[model samples]
Target: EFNILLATDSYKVTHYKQYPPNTSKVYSYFECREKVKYEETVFYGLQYILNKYLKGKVVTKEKIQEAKDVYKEHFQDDVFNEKGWNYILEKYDGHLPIEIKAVPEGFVIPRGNVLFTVENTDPECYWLTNWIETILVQSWYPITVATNSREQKKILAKYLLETSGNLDGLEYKLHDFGYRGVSSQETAGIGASAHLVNFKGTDTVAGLALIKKYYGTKDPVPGYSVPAAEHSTITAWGKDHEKDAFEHIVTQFSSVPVSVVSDSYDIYNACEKIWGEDLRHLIVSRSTQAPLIIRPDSGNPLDTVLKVLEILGKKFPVTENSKGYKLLPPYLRVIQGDGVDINTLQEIVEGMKQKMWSIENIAFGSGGGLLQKLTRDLLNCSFKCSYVVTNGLGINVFKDPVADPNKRSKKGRLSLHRTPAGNFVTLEEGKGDLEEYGQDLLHTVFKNGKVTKSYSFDEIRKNAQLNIELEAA
Candidate 1:
C-alpha cells in the first residue's frame, strides 16, 4: 500500500512541501552518531519496488488502465486536483531519475558516519521524487538489527576470550530464536539475516530464504539449527512421563546434537535428578559425535545457570582449562535461552567465570532481545537533505533544533572519508574536490533505479568484521 501510495506524482505536493520550484536536485545522506559494531545496513526492499511499481514489469494495457482507475478513485479529492498523478500517467516514463550511492552492504562504519547518499540525477524530475527519501530511510531494520547482533557478538567475544582462552564456539554462541518474536514474516527474515552476519546458528527459518532471495545464497545455507524441544512438545508428554520424553530424544537423535528445554515443570529437578542421576549414564555413553544440551528456560538466568552447571559438574567428570576454570565434558552442556541479551549474556559469562567455570560450558539463544527490540534512536540513526541544486546553483540546506542541539543536521553535499589519524570524518562536498581529500568511504550501489553493486552472505559477514576501537562510554 505504501509503495502504491508513494508511486503517485502527487507526492511532491502532498508529501514534502519544504521546497519550491527551480529545484533541480536534492542530495541527502543517512548516518548514525554512536560507535556501533555493524555500521552499514543491508540495502534491501528497494530493488523489489523499483522493478514492480516504478519501472513496472511487463503488464497488459488493460491492467494499467484498471490501476489508473483505482488511483483516481482513491486520490482524486474534491479539494485538490491531482495534476501530479495525471502528469505521471501521461508524461513520466518507467524510469527513476535518481542515483543511490552507498557503502557496500555489510561494511563496517563508525558513529556519525555516512552509509549512503541519494540525489536527483535528472534535472527535470526534481521535487516530483523527493518523497522517495522516506522509503529508503525506513530501510533501517537491517542496520539496526545488524548492529545489535554484532554488538552481541563482540560482547560474547570478550567473555569467551577471557573464560575459554579462545573463541571456539563463538559462531554458534548466540542463536537467533527470534522468528516468533518479531512482528511479521519480513521482519523475521530481514532481522534473521542480519543476525547471520555475525553468527551461524538460527531458528528463524525465513531468514535463510531471504539470504537466498536477496543475497543469492544457495545450499550450505548460512545458518544452522539443532533439533530442539519446546514447551508444547514436552508438556504434552505429561509430568509423569518427563523421563520418557527425554529418553525419547536421546534414542532418536543420539548421534546428533539436540537441545531439550528442561524447564517444562521443575527445571532443577529435571536437571539434577533426571538428567544428572537417572540419565547421566545414557548421556555420557551416547555417541560422542554430538553433545546433549540442557536448557533452563525460566528463572534468574545468571543464578540458575551457575546452579545448574554445578549440579551437572558434580555428577559428571570435568576438565580444567589453562585459565583454571572447569570445562564441561564434551558429552554435556547447557543453553541459557531465557532472558538472554547483551547485558544478561555478559553477566552470565562473568558469573560463571567467577565460579571458575569455562564459558564453553554454555551457549545462548535470544528471541525478542535479539531481533525485535530496537529503534532508529538506539544508535541515533537519522536521514536528512543536506544539499539542494536550484536554478543552476548549489545551496546547502540544514535544520537546527535549539531544543535539542544533537538534532542539528549536516549541510551541503556530504562525503565521508578516513583521515590520516585513522578516524572517520564527514566533509562538505563543495568545500573542496573529493579527489583532493582522503579516500572516501561512500560507494555507488544504486543508480538509474538499478542496483549496481551486489554482495554475498560471506562478503557481508566479512565486511561487518571491524577492528575499530570501541567507545569508552
Candidate 2:
C-alpha cells in the first residue's frame, strides 16, 4: 500500500535533485509573509507529516524499489540515477534525511514571519531533502483551514463578548458541515481536525478520529456532532408529511441534542406554523436536557436566518441581556448550514447583531467554503530556499521577480523570534542568538527522522488563545 510516494506529484520525485552539485547543501523554510484574506495564520499539520510520512517504520525496502521502478517507467528512460536513489535507500534506512523546527501546532503566527525551516541534516543526503518541501508544503491546507477557523473564532469571540458579555459557547458556534463537500476522505478527516482546533462542534466525524490518532487524545474527544437530518431524509417523507419528519427528529433524539433541517418544503412554515404551532408542545415539553437545533439548509443565509429568528423571537419567550440584545429560550436554537463561508458568516452575525439579537441565538455550519475552497495563494503561503552552502561558503538565495515585486522572497537562513515589543520578527539565523533579541519561537519539532515535540489539542488551543490575549492587551 505504501509502494508509491502517496500524496505527491510524480514530477516532484523525478526532478527532486535538479539542483547544482556545489549547491548540495540547501536550507529552505516555509512562511506566510502576507495575508491574502485572513488576518493571521495558525501553524498546524507538521505532526501529520512526522507521524504519517517521515517516520522510518512506514517506509520499507520494497516501497523504495517500487517507487524507483515507477519513477523510471514514467520518465521512459534512464533519467533517474539508480545509484544515487539507491544511496538514499541504504543511507536513509527508510527515513527522511532532514531536520525540521517549527512553531508548535496551533501557534497563531503573524504575517511576514517564518513558520518553520527544513534542511538536510546530513551533507551527503542534500538531494534527498528536497522532497521535504513537496510533502511538507501540503500542510498549507490544514494550516490555512486552522488559521481561517481561528480567525473566525476571533470574529465570533468579539461579538460574543459584546453581545453576551462572555465566550460561553464559542466552540459550538461554528460547527463543521464540510465532510461531504470535501475532495476525499483524507480531506474530511484533516479539514475537520483543523476546524476542531478552534471549535468543539462538528458534523465531520472523521475529523474526530483523526485528532485522536494524530494528537493522541482519549475518548470524549475534542470534536462533537449531533444527530442531524439531511434534505433527503426530510424530503423523502414528502412535502405533505414534512410535519411528521420534523416531529420524528424531535422525538427520536429527545434524549440528546439533535438538529433537524426544516426547509424541505416551506422553511418559514416549518419554523413559524409547524414548529411554532404544531410541534411546540412536544418540543417545549421535552424532559431531556438537549436543545432542539433547527437547521435551515437552503436559501439566502443572511436574509433567511433573520427571517427565521424574527419568527422564533415572536413564538418563543425571549430575554434581554445587559446590552439589550435578545436571547432565545434555552430549549430552542438555530444553525444556518447553507452557503456559509467566512464572509457570509460575518454578514449573518452582523445582520443578527443589527437586529438586536444575541450572537448565541444562531450557530453556523460550512461545507465547501470551509474545507475545499482555499488555496496556498489564499495565505500567500510558499516554501523557498533562502540560503545555500557551497564550498563551505554560505550564499543568500532570493528571488526579485520583475513581473511582480510582491513575489519577492526572503533571503539567508532565517530565524523567527518575538521582539521585546511583542511583535514577531524574522532575522538572519545566527544574528539573534542572544537573549535580549527575543525568545526563538521556532523549536525542533522533528529531527534526524523522528518527532521531538508532542502537543495535545488542549495545549495547542491555549498556545493560540494566549497569543490572541497578548495581542489584545
Candidate 3:
C-alpha cells in the first residue's frame, strides 16, 4: 500500500427535463381560436386566435380569459392572421400587440443597433411586454453567451479542435458550462443553445429538450446540451492534501470526466499524482478519448500550467504526451474557472508566446462574475437613445440623433444596405438615393400566427462561427 489511490472515467445515462408535452401545440391552438373580426375582440383575444388558428383551440375560456384587456391592442390580427408567429411562448400566452425588429439570433449587432425592438400596440397593452421581460432577458443572455463565446473560440480555435478524439469540427465545440453561472433554469438552457449555434457542447443538459421542442430538432447534438450518457459535475474541499484530494476525485467520479475542484487540497502535487500513469490511464480508458477536464482551481494559471508542463516533462516524455492526447497542448484543456474573465483570457494568450505554453492549452469556466457581472448601464439596457413618438399635427415629431460621430439612432424607418460584397449596410433615414436595400438582414421567419421559417442546426452553426464579431452586445 504505497499510499495508493485509484481512478476511472464513469459513464452514466442521463435524463433531462422536457417541456410538458403539447405545450407548444397548446400555445399554437390558443392563437388560432382567438382570431376575430372585431379589433377589440380580436386584439384582446389575438393570442388565443393565433393559437386556435394553427392548432384549433380546445382550451377552456378560464385558461385564456384571465388575460388582461390590454393584451389585445398589441396584436394586429390582420397582420398576424395572414402571417405566422416566429416563436410560441408560454409566458406571454398570446396577449399584447407587439412587433419586434431584431437582428437574427446569432448575428452580431452593435450596442445601439436594436437587437429587436419591442413595443406594445396599445398603450395599456405595453405592460404585457414589460411583464414578459423575465422571459426575454433570459433568452437574450444565452444568445449573448453563444456570440461572445464565438470570439473566444476564434482566438482558441486551433487549440479547441485539435483535441485527441475530437471527430467533430471546430465549429461544433461551443461548450455550455453556463448553468452555475446563469440566473435561472430556463435562461441556462436557452442561453446554452445560443452558444450551441456554433459549438454544440454544453454542460446545460436541460437545454437539449427546449431546443428540440421550440426548434423542432430531431437528433441529439454533441456535448452536455444533447442527451449524453451522463452529465459532468465537480467537488473538492480543504487545502494542501493534493494527493488525498485527487484520490477523492478518482474515487467519486471513477473516471468519467468528473470535474475535480483540484485547487482545494494541493494544486501541484494533485497534478503529479492524479495524472500519474496509473490514474491517468484509468481516466483515459473510461473516457472515449481522455480525462474530460483537468482543472486548475487556483493560482496564476498561465504560470501554473507552465510549471505543470515542466514537471510532467521531468516525470514523462513530452513527445509521448503531446502526440498521444493533444491534451497537454490543447485537448485535455486546463479550464481557468476561478474568477476568470475575457480580459484575463486576452492577457494570458498574449503572454503565452513569452510563457512558452500555447494559448490553446487552456479553456474557460466562469461564474456569476460573468453572468451577474456589469451594471445595466454597461450593457445595452438603458441606452441614452430613445425612439420619439409624435402626434402628426405639428406637435411632436421624433428627432433622429445625428448619426455621425456616435452612430446613435435617428427616427424614421431604416434603409438596409445590400453591398456588392454580399452583406448588409446601414443608411441613416432617407440619406440614400433611390434604391432598394438588401432585405436579407431580417426576414419574416415567423408571421402573424404561424411559424413559417425554420433554421437548421448546421445553419445556426455557420452563423455562430462566421458572425461572431457581432456578439459583443
Candidate 4:
C-alpha cells in the first residue's frame, strides 16, 4: 500500500501516454510566486521529506502489481504505467532514477526565485520527475511556517533592540504551543519544527522527534519547553485553593522558568493577591533565579497582558535599565498564548514600549495561529514543468494564461545565483546552468535515491536568521 507508484495524483498514472511520442526528458522547478507573505522565503523541510519518503529503494514488484490492480479498479481502464514502473523496478532495483537540486535548507531567498529543480536522470524515466511533485511540493509547509516564524523573530528582535538595548535570550521570546492545535502529529512534526528554525522555545515534542529522526547527527536538540500548568491542573485544586496551586507551581520548580496558567480563576487577583501577596515571599526570593512565568490566556491579548504586567510591576519592585525602560523584577513575567500571531505579538510588544516597559518583561506563545493558521497560498507555492527534451531536442515549456498572467510559469531550465551586488536572482532559460553565468546557489541535494548533501540543524538556523541590517530594523 505504501508503493511509490501510488504516491501521486491518480491522473499522473495516465500522463506517460499523453506526453509527446519521443519525449525523453522532463525538467521542472518549484518556487513561491511573485506575491508572498514575506519578500523572501526560508527554504526548509525538504530534507525531512527526502529522508522520510523519497530516499529509499522504494519500488517493488508487489508495489507495481498492487498499483496496477488498484488503477484497474479505480480507473476501470488499463491506464497504469505498468511498463514504466517495471522498467524502474528492473533497471534501478526500486531506487528512483531522478536528480534533485535545491538551495541548502534554511537559505532565505527572495520570492519568484527557483528554490529547487527536479529532472530525470535517465531519458527513459522522464515521467519520474513530476510524479513525485505530489510530495515534494509539500516543502511549502515548513517553508511557510519557517518564513512566518523568521519574520516574527525579526519583528521581536527589532523592538527588543529598541526597548531592552540588548537581545539576550531573544530565542526564548516566542515559544511554540502548537502540538495540540495543529492538524496531526506529523503536521506538528513538520510545522512546529519549522518554527524552531528561528526560535528556541517550544512545547511540541513531535517536532523535536522529527528533527532528531531526520536531521540528527550528534542528535542535537533544537528547542525546549519548561514545566507548565494547564487550566485543568489549576482548576483541579478548586477555587478556594488557588494560592495553593500557585504556591505549588513556584515551589515545585524552585525557579527554572516554570509557567502557571493564572487565568483559570481571576488572573488579576492571581497576580495581585495570590502570586503578588500570598506567594510574594516565595517569588521575590527567586525572581532572581529564573522567570516564574505567569500565563494570561484570555481577553484582549494586548490590553490584558499589559494590565497583567502593570499589576505585577506594582506588586514587585522594578528597576531601570540602560535603555531607560521599566524592567520588571525577573522572578515575575507574563506569557500570552492567547490572541497572539504575528500582528498581536507586535501590538502587545509595542504596547510595552509605549508604557515605558522593557520587552524583557514578557514573552509570547502561540498555537492555532502559529502552526495551523497558514496555507500553501500564504507563499503562493507552485511547482511547474519548465522544460522538456523530445527526440534529442531541447525545448522551453511555459504557460501564459491570458486569464491571469500572474500564473505564468518560467521557461527553460532554471538556476539560482547571486549577482556581484550580492542580491539573489533566478537565471531562466538555461542561463544559470552555464559556466560563464556566475555561480548557481542550487546544490545537488539528492540523486538516484541518495541524499547526497545535507546540513546540520544549527547550520540551517544560522541561514534562516535575519541579516545584520534586517536585524537592526
Q: Which candidate tops lDDT?
A: 4
Question: Which residue pairs show collisions in model 4?
Answer: 287-331
lDDT of 4 by residue, 85-113 (tens): 88988998888899999999989988899
Candidate 2 residue-wise lDDT, 217-314, digit = tens: 65468877778788898889877999998888788888787788888878999999999999998778764368888898788999999999999888
Which 10-residue window in model 4 sums to the lowest lDDT?
464-473
Q: How does model 4 fare in lDDT?
A: 0.88
Using Cα atoms with residue i matched to residue i, what is each candidate's TM-score against the true structure? 0.89, 0.93, 0.61, 0.96
Arranged by TM-score with the best first, the candidates are 4, 2, 1, 3
Candidate order (lDDT)? 4, 2, 1, 3
Q: What is the C-alpha RMSD of each candidate to the true structure, in Å?
A: 3.9, 2.4, 15.2, 1.8
lDDT-best of 3 and 4: 4
Q: RMSD in angstroms, candidate 3?
A: 15.2
Error of 4 at 64 (Å): 1.1
> How do the residues 1-473 of candidate 3 rate in per-residue lDDT, one tens digit apiece?
11000010111000001222222110100000111111110001112112222222222233333222222343322111111111123323443344433344345444333333334343323222233333333333444455455555564554433332232345433345557777788656555555555555667776676566555344564345221111122233333344454555555655354555555445576567666554565444444333435666678856766666555445443433332432242224455666555566556555544544543455565545434453322233321112322231111113244753333333433344556876445544333344655453544333332443455554455454542234422
Which candidate, 1 or 4, has the higher TM-score?
4
The reply for model 4, stretches above 4 Å from the true place, is 217-220, 433-436, 469-473
List the global CA lDDT of all models.
0.74, 0.80, 0.41, 0.88
